[PDB]
Symmetry: C3
Subunit: 116 residues, 3 copies
Amino acid sequence: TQNVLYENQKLIANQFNSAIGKIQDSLSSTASALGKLQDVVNQNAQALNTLVKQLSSNFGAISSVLNDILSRLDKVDVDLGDISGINASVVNIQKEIDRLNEVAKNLNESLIDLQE
Amino acid sequence: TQNVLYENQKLIANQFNSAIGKIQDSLSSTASALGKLQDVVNQNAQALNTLVKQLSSNFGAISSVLNDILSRLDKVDVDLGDISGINASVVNIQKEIDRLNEVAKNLNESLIDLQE
Amino acid sequence: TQNVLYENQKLIANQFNSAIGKIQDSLSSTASALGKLQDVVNQNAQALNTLVKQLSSNFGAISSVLNDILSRLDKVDVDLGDISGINASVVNIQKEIDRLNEVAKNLNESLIDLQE
């Protein structure tokens, strides 16, 4: 029984350690994917905001030129739709990303080193 | 051997329980990050859609004013590009988020309470 | 002691195997959620880019019609804001998604089959 029991414990430690290594990689991959999603979402939010600000300035100019045209045509007050309140939010998941990376490293302390 | 074998089992249970706690936190962090990404992506999708609808109404008005101007200038049919089919999709990962939170809680049932 | 020790090992293997199954599901859920986020972010990035390209073509046409109008009004050089450099990035986390799915399947090899 003692040789089956000790070989069992070795098998358990080895399989556990093996599973922990695989989980560490999966946490690092997850952290990496979240970081890239966070960056692109925030980049595309900033693009949308920049777009909005430049558009409403383009509608301002168009409105001013149209108004000038209309008066000069009377010689022989058009308000375009305001978009400047449209706003894309940014995301912040850095604390969650840091936690996953911290656990991937911390799980090293959970490895089993059996006594021979 | 019996004292090494039992101390081994204690070490294994304790290290496993320790690893499970760390994995639970990582699942909760992942669930939290996915929820925030889902919310911002969907918010910015709605902003883009609202923007599209207001823009094409702005091009409608511009077209109508330009057309009026052109006729009055003849007295002494411009079609602007249609954007109204541009559409941002929304994302729904709530079932995946619920599963991660459910596993974080369920893994409590996987903890080892050894017999002394 | 030998019957407590062997029943302990059974309990450990069973609880570990149980925890591994739950972690596999959580990895598959995470992989699934990342894939859906990647797809919607990239879809909405393409919508934003398509929108930008069609808008600046709409401002080109408006500029050309306004310019024509202004000359005909003189008979009895307006530059609108350029947006064509606004660009939404796409995200690529497929390698991270593949790693999570690969670990979910690989962890099958980490299961414990004890010797009776």
